[PDB]
Amino acid sequence: KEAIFNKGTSKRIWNELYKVIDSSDVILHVLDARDPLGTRCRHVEKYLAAEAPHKHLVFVLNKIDLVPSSQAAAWIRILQKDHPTCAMRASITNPFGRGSLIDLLRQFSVLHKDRKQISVGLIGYPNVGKSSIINALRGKAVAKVAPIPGETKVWQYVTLMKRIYLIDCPGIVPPNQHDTPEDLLLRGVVRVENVEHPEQYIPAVLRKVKQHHMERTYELRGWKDHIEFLEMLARKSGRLLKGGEPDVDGVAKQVLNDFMRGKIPWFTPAPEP
Amino acid sequence: KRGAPGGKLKMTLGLPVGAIMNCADNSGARNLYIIAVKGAGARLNRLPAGGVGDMVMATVKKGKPELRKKVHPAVIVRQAKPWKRFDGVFLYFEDNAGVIVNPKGEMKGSAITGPVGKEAAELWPRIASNAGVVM
Amino acid sequence: AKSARASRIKENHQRFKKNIAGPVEAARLERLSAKLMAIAQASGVKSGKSIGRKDSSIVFPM
Amino acid sequence: TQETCSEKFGAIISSFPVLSDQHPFHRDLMNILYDADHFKVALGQISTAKNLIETISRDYVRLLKYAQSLYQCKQLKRAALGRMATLIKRLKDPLIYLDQVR
Amino acid sequence: EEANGGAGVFNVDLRKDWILENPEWKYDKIPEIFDGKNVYDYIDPDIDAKL
Amino acid sequence: PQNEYIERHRKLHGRRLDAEERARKKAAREGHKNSENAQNLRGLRAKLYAKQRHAQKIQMRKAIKQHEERNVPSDPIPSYLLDRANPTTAARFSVPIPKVRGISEEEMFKVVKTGKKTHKKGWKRIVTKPTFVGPDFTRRPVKYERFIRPMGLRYKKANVTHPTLNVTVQLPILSVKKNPSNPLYTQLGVLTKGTIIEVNVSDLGIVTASGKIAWGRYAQITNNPENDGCVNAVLLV
Amino acid sequence: SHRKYEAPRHGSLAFLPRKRAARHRGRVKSFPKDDPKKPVHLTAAMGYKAGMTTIVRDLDRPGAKAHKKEVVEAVTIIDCPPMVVVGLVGYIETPRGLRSLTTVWAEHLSDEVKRRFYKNWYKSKKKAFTKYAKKYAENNGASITRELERIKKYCTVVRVLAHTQIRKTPLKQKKAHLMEIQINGGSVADKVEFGRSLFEKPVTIDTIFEKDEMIDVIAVTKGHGFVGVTARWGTKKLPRKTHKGLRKVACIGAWHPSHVQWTVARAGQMGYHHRTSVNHKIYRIGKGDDEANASTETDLTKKKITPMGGFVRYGEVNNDYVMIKGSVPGVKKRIMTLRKSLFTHTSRKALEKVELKWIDTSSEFGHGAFQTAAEKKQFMGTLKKDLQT
RNA sequence: GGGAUGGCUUGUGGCGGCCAAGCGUUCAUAGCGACGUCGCUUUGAUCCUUCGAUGUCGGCUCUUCCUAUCAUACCGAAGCAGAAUUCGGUAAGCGUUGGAUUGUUCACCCACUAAUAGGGAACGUGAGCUGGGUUUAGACCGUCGUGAGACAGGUUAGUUUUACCCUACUGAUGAACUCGUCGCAAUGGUAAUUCAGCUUAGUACGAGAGGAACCGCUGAUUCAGAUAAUUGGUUUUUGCGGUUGUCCGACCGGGCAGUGCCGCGAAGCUACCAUCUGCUGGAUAAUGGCUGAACGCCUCUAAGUCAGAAUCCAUGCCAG
RNA sequence: GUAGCCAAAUGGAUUAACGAGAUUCCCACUGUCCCUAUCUACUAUCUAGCGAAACCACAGCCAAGGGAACGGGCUUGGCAAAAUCAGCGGGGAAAGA
RNA sequence: UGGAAGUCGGAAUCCGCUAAGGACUGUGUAACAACUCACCUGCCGAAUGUACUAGCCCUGAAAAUGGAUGGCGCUCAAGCGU
Ligand SMILES: Nc1nc2c(ncn2[C@@H]2O[C@H](COP(=O)(O)OP(=O)(O)OP(=O)(O)O)[C@@H](O)[C@H]2O)c(=O)[nH]1
Ligand SMILES: [Mg+2]
Ligand SMILES: [Mg+2]
């Protein structure tokens, strides 16, 4: 197995995580709206339920602009049975849910007015939008934001108000023995530039995305399998090697990057009640 | 038993670790990427290398996806580097090529395209049975 | 592996020398000696039979 | 020390047959020749000792990160080795039983 | 082979089972090269009539 | 082969012809061999051999004494308590350890250096001994955290022994009452030798004269937790 | 601290110092042990390296993959004109080693061996051994007789003095090579009588050595001059544009002693080293007067061992020659010392008999394709200068 | 202006109780106490609990040493049938590799292999080369401060540049003894290594599955020393030929473009990219014995003595 | 909502072009490497002429000991033979250190 | 106990005949048998056995360039005690 799929499981990253947990009173667990139960960290939830009941865990469903509003409301309804959930589109210029999240943090600070301040640490998978949430709450680009996973390598304090601190943390991936490298790559753990044979994960993308969405995305139709799809995409876009041979590897890397970066429409439907 | 064959005279090793050679049988693979050589020694900084008739450990880079994610034993049957046989003849083929086998030496495929080398033919009796030209 | 200086290897080589290579080298030496025989054959004081004296020190000088 | 203990205990655990995976004839034959409960309890004690040795090693490495002198480091090392030795010492009877079974 | 040194020592005679017109020719040194020419390329059973 | 095949071969064919004689001669040479080992082994092998021989000699002396002596519970317990494994069971209000070694602040604290320059600030202090941080503990932020109590040095349970009952139970630590070296060490919760701690004694089965259940008592730490990796305490009764 | 990855040492300490040889002619350090039950024989000989060529051999090696097949092998030709025996040295045993008691010379010595005793022979009066030659005539050789009796009754090791006939070689050198050759076998009296019988006589190479024998070759290697560590010891080159040099050793020292070790690879003299290489098989001893000595039983081309156009930088081989499988320590024109093997052989390769099928006599001055000039003319045909002549 | 713990360490926990040969005490029957023992620290599971850089490491090249031995040699024991091993002993002669991974204490994985053992000579401060701790001057973000600025921090770019001296080392000459030829050998160095195949033999052994070994033979790995017949490489052989631009009026024959460029190219040098070669005696260690006392049995040991490891010392080999 | 409603086509900062800015990857390419070899010019080399400087208490082979963890001079050993040339970078010297 | 006879186990462990002999110290059998030990007698022939104490000697842990009772060397000392 490639060493890139072990990213997010490092001793340094988990030392950073436990440092943030020990230093934080409120823990914002950030979920991808396209895969909430996929991005949920029941490992950290079990640790918080077992060892630190005094720390307040709050769900933040980020990237709700990439999913239908009905599915977002259903996922909020599912998660609010366990923990208080806030939907948010993290952006400096055009945010959503910023006022509700600010009000909830102000309520927590009012509850802990005996302290000098409260600390709110952000946890989740890589590339779920933790730095974007901090930047959107501050209204100013204070934390680095990139579509490349693992942009945040160390923890960082940002002073939100006089009594509210925000703690940015690197993204963690808890180890699961039923998790596959294809599952991790589709969740967004790794960079597809550093993976070998990207073509094999294209059937997973074609399963997750409806066919007509791919048709309007790439203005292409008539493929019977992923190899033909990548070949016609390479010939259309001009991704050719020496002799006009298609650049199927590079086209697959482009498709995987567009799938992760919210350019091809896909979501996981909420389970019906 | 390991894949290194006995009774093999010394010849020039033309394929070090990292070489991509053609896949000369019909197993489904188009090329083999060499990651190791059976019977290689131990020197600092020296890449392991193989010649015609050697068993190597190979990875399929182009071919069927079923063959893609495994390491296969392969036998080098053709090489481009010129080597000498005991009758004084230096010779070489126009490409480097090998066939996928099992650790005992039975072939994965059913037929061989192109000729095979003599050294491969004596050292592996299944390749001698599946070769149309021995050359 | 057994080294070159191994006692069992030495005994193996001694048996080989005594039983196998020995007679062959002896016959060759006999033939060469015979050939070089073919090539080679192809008062006491006043006669030199009594070996007289020819015409740093170990002691202290005295 | 923990790596050596884990290697030996894992070899013992993986080498013995798994009664849940056997054919009914072989499983019931081992249940007749050997007590199946005793067999499973002995191997469970082996696995428990292996896990506890790993836990003790992790705890004492974490303490040795903060140890400040050679005397304190030596006391922590001897403490870890003695606790692992005590864990092995409580396994006197399962090892004899498993050697006879082997 | 066992009576004559064993495997790896015994030297087999390949010309013993040759079938020739005269068995005295079974251990001849057959000429192969003569003045830059292959003798086998010039071997012809009806050489006398052509000569 | 199957079942006891070496014993069956033993029945059918026996030993080698010199097996008994060689074994007898080896058993005879054992005395010379043991003295040669006692005089010629070197180092750790010799030390282990000496301790083993000492143990065998003591065991042999005990066996001989028992054989010479062959020709010649304690506390009253009811019938349902007979044949079970039971403990042996053996003003100035002074603790068992009234005085310990004093620990200076230079030994207690090490300086954590901060800054990117060659000259670095030194205001942060790190506690080098085990601590009890209490429940509902949230760490101070790094800009206002002077005293660093690392997570791997924090403890929550202790092996507390009751002297009268001779029972040692692992009990949760409730608080740190008095560290003998410094009230700052008491405030930081440092667990050292001679420290008076408050322990949860619910598992010990202690009731008061009024019938109320006593679930908090005082124990004294009787070891060095930084050297031992564990907290051992004795109840003050 | 310890070196992280183990690696075997570059070069051997058995061949130190890597300095020039003290003498151009190779020294026989040891002779085979003397067995008095053997008949008297000579243990060494000299020749001149002429060059190399190719053969085809019908291999009879049971157990090998090339058994009953033809193998192409490289061989070295040594031109061996017969030596002349001119002297006899007696050696005694002392608690300080072997000691030369006396030596006896022949009545007549050649000019080429008298040249060895001079540096300016052309200006010389050539008086060497002239007063010695009168000892054979005075008193019927009484002094010669008493020296022979002294060797007979006091000595244990007898060596002849033998020199080469360098005038039969194409070399421009006229000064011959003189060496001591031990007489092994027999009693000391037999050795003395044998040497006196061999005085002033030529000894050919085929009465000292025989085909299928494995011998030792002693010679001085090709000189390379002053050579850096990379070629001299085989060290790994430093990366490209390394400061202060890349064909160097990065650390001659990094530890105590505060010194440079004798075991550290350093630049210096490479080549011109004295070497004794053992176990070389003789494939043919060809005769000088035989005109078809490069012919075999299956190659009926009647030709000599000299390649077409001659040996490059040597000339023609006109005397008896020895064909040796493989390579020898020296170079062309160089004196070679052939010696008997010190011990009885332990291989089947020494017991193998050689059957040559063909010997390459094509030109080594290029890509020669013809074995004889008649073959070249037969392939080419009639040329313009043929009709012009 | 002033500076830059150590005959330490190793393999076996701590606290509390009990027992305890013994030391003591036997006007007090207390107190120390090895060996032990007892209490605390999942029916082969779970995988939904990774718990703090103030202390900084590396890589290359290359040499040597230690043994606390992974492999190779020999040996002792084990239900060790065989095969494969496990535990231990003598042993450092000889080896101990190739890679992926920096969203990071770079340590874990993968394969080849006989095996991929661990350390020192720095790290008890410290000029061979080069990446990180690491930090002059430029700049940005985060935290703190009203601010100059400082830092919990994160990112980016950034000047030390010997050797011709002494010694050591590697090579090369040399006065004195007339010049030269042939020698000896004190002393110093020292070298080979591992695997596979054939036969034994589908035999011993085994219910079956399977499955050896000594003797003999043939190759290969790693190392070492040479060599250039052949095959590749290299071309100022500017040897021959082709070709662009320009110049000598054209042709011929040439110049220039620092070897104009290109094809072949002898010779020389070179490459496990080519070929050849690498050798035998004595004494031992662990152990296994013979004879035989101590000690009327017994005993490989005490006197005497046999055999035995890749070990030691030499020969073969290099210097002289 | 497998893609809705409301707003004057769009719902954007996931901002195009530009860059001796920093980073990852693919094809091609190759002496970066396996694993080194060869050729040319200028040096280095030797000669004629010309001709400095840095630096310099005195000097220069090691081993063990020399309490103040330091020896080059002391003690005890090993040893130890004129005068030299080309190189090397261990040590001493040597960084406007 | 399938079998268990002193000798796979659990618990008892007595008497007779005795010169003396365990409800057995080991080897052995499927169990027996058989051998052996504890103990006794005959032969022999004069001093021994056990446990401690004090001297001297060996072991009672060692790394890494080649070296140190100062060096040679020393064994009824040129070591140790008077
Ligand atoms: N469509 C959409 N994209 C978002 C939103 N929030 C964040 N993103 C994108 O998600 C990407 C990854 O999130 P980040 O801002 O890097 O935060 P993160 O989850 O901590 O990622 P890491 O720092 O790598 O761990 C960013 O490039 C944003 O552009 C959102 O609300 N909607
Ligand atoms: Mg982030
Ligand atoms: Mg990111």
Side-chain angles (χ1 to χ4, degrees), chain A residues 146-176:
Chain A
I148 301 301
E151 178 68 29
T152 297
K153 294 157 187 60
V154 286
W155 62 271
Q156 176 190 358
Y157 285 175
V158 169
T159 294
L160 179 61
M161 287 167 215
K162 291 297 291 182
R163 297 197 59 247
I164 302 181
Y165 291 163
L166 307 173
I167 317 173
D168 202 6
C169 178
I172 53 153
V173 190
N176 179 22

Side-chain angles (χ1 to χ4, degrees), chain A residues 185-196:
Chain A
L185 190 148
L186 259 59
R187 287 187 181 99
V189 173
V190 304
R191 312 163 186 194
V192 300
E193 285 80 15
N194 296 294
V195 303
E196 60 87 20

Side-chain angles (χ1 to χ4, degrees), chain A residues 62-66 88-91 125-133 144-152 168-171:
Chain A
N62 202 33
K63 305 177 177 180
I64 54 175
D65 63 320
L66 304 179
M88 174 150 195
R89 192 260 177 270
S91 166
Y125 285 176
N127 267 356
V128 293
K130 301 184 295 296
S131 304
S132 289
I133 280 171
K144 283 210 70 65
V145 162
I148 301 301
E151 178 68 29
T152 297
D168 202 6
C169 178

Side-chain angles (χ1 to χ4, degrees), chain G residues 120-373:
Chain G
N120 306 124
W121 162 265
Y122 78 112
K123 289 185 311 176
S124 168
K125 301 296 188 293
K126 310 162 186 182
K127 308 296 295 298
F129 290 88
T130 46
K131 322 289 188 62
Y132 187 88
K134 306 188 174 63
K135 300 170 76 171
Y136 270 82
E138 293 179 353
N139 290 318
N140 297 349
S143 58
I144 306 304
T145 306
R146 68 184 68 188
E147 293 314 304
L148 288 168
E149 294 296 324
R150 190 190 311 273
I151 301 181
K152 280 192 185 182
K153 87 160 293 182
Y154 287 125
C155 296
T156 60
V157 167
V158 186
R159 306 180 187 164
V160 293
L161 282 151
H163 70 87
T164 53
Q165 314 200 237
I166 207 168
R167 50 177 182 71
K168 295 175 153 73
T169 67
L171 309 187
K172 293 182 183 293
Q173 177 177 342
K174 311 172 182 182
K175 180 171 72 176
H177 288 105
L178 174 69
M179 89 166 289
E180 286 179 4
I181 304 173
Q182 185 155 315
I183 315 171
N184 272 2
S187 71
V188 173
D190 302 348
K191 296 161 186 286
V192 172
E193 293 179 353
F194 182 52
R196 193 217 299 111
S197 302
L198 280 178
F199 276 173
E200 297 181 11
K201 289 185 178 172
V203 175
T204 55
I205 193 66
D206 60 316
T207 64
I208 305 175
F209 300 109
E210 177 185 304
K211 169 189 169 289
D212 308 331
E213 193 174 4
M214 294 178 71
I215 64 168
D216 310 337
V217 179
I218 303 166
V220 182
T221 57
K222 187 220 280 184
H224 303 98
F226 202 98
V227 167
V229 298
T230 300
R232 202 194 191 208
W233 295 95
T235 64
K236 174 78 56 189
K237 298 173 60 187
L238 301 182
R240 176 200 57 84
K241 210 58 185 187
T242 296
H243 194 240
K244 64 90 176 179
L246 61 85
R247 294 180 63 86
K248 279 180 166 184
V249 165
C251 299
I252 57 169
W255 319 100
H256 294 89
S258 295
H259 276 289
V260 180
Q261 307 286 64
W262 66 287
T263 54
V264 174
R266 308 281 262 168
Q269 167 71 32
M270 185 192 212
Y272 206 73
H273 306 312
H274 181 277
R275 290 295 170 255
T276 301
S277 59
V278 301
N279 292 352
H280 291 289
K281 184 88 156 187
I282 296 178
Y283 276 177
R284 175 166 289 197
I285 300 190
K287 300 303 290 181
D289 61 357
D290 187 19
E291 194 295 333
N293 51 12
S295 176
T296 60
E297 291 91 297
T298 54
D299 184 15
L300 304 183
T301 303
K302 186 180 289 293
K303 60 178 180 173
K304 302 259 295 178
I305 198 63
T306 310
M308 184 177 177
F311 274 115
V312 169
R313 277 180 288 114
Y314 185 77
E316 315 274 321
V317 177
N318 302 139
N319 306 296
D320 301 344
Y321 69 95
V322 173
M323 183 178 307
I324 292 179
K325 172 200 169 55
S327 48
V328 293
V331 297
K332 284 158 167 269
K333 308 194 203 71
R334 188 154 287 172
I335 186 69
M336 304 283 141
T337 306
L338 314 177
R339 190 196 65 188
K340 298 274 194 181
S341 294
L342 307 178
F343 320 104
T344 309
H345 293 274
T346 53
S347 306
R348 299 286 175 173
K349 284 172 176 52
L351 302 172
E352 289 171 6
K353 67 182 290 294
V354 190
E355 179 65 30
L356 301 188
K357 292 178 73 69
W358 171 75
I359 302 165
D360 184 29
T361 51
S362 62
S363 172
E364 54 178 26
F365 200 51
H367 305 266
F370 312 106
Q371 303 294 309
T372 56

